[PDB]
Design a protein around this ligand. Structure first.
Ligand SMILES: Nc1ncnc2[nH]cnc12
Length: 278
């Protein structure tokens, strides 16, 4: 069935694309903070609540990206359970969606939301230029989209690149301190030359293995069976992550994963609701 409450965000995070590096870090930190299950941290990193079983996706938040403090922003509709971008709202009021039939009253943008859909391959992630101008152009491209505009291959290619830019600079930055830190480091005052950069293979591997890295750290919290030794972190070498300390410094917020001996979906949602979570 269709998603619910896409129009009723649990919170809205706003960033002015011309704002400082520190304000970008505050913006990303605040998203993580509002997404977290207050009852579930791992090594002092927040864990998302589980995905609600046996209902359509019904927990959403909004990100608003502004070209200026007084500009109307581009609104992104993102799932609050797995931080998946599914919709965006252009200046003419049109909700555009990345999955056909998912969001009530939305218009399908013409391409899917996966990196395979956007890039052709999750390996081209290391080709995406990240920076302040790239962010501004991305907001402009998507915010400027109009329903009435006739179909265009070049316009589609622009939109795909724009969505990819935001996924890395918003969604992946939320998920990963490596990514958020990399992006914040490219953001400078106007007295500094315009800058951009591209992620390396470690951050590409992290982005492509968010569930794996999350589960790997979560397993370390599991109380060990009688007669056996407590679980040690298992390095994911492609991610450049070899210790739990490195995992914690890497993870911005963990995807909930059921690991043997860990919290179940039901139990983790129970603790989430008990701590005031919605
Ligand atoms: N639409 C999307 N939202 C979040 N992460 C993604 N990774 C690939 N596609 C994504």
């Amino acid at each position: 069935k269709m998603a619910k409450n896409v129009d009723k965000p649990l919170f809205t995070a706003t960033f002015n694309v011309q704002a400082s590096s520190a304000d970008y870090a505050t913006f990303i930190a605040g998203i993580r903070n509002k997404l977290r299950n207050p009852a579930h941290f791992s090594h002092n990193r927040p864990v998302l609540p589980p995905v609600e079983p046996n209902v359509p996706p019904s927990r959403w938040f909004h990100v608003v990206l502004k070209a200026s403090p007084t500009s109307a922003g581009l609104t992104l509709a993102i799932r609050a359970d797995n931080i998946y971008l599914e919709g965006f709202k252009s200046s003419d009021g049109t909700w555009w969606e990345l999955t056909p039939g998912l969001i009530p009253g939305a218009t399908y943008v013409g391409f899917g939301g996966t990196y395979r859909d956007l890039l052709g391959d999750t390996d081209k992630l290391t080709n995406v230029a990240l920076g302040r101008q790239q962010l501004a152009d991305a907001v402009t491209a998507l915010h400027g989209r109009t329903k009435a505009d006739k179909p265009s291959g070049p316009k589609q290619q622009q939109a795909r690149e724009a969505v990819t830019t935001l996924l890395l600079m918003v969604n992946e930055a939320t998920r990963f301190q490596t990514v958020s830190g990399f992006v914040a480091g490219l953001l400078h005052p106007k007295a500094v030359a315009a800058a951009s950069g591209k992620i390396g293979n470690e951050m590409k591997a992290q982005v492509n293995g968010w569930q794996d890295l999350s589960a790997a750290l979560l397993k370390t919290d599991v109380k060990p069976p009688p007669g056996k030794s407590p679980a040690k972190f298992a390095p994911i070498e492609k991610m450049g992550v070899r210790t739990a300390v490195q995992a914690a410094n890497t993870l911005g917020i963990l995807l909930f994963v059921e690991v043997p001996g860990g919290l179940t979906v039901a139990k983790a949602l129970e603790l989430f609701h008990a701590s005031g979570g919605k």
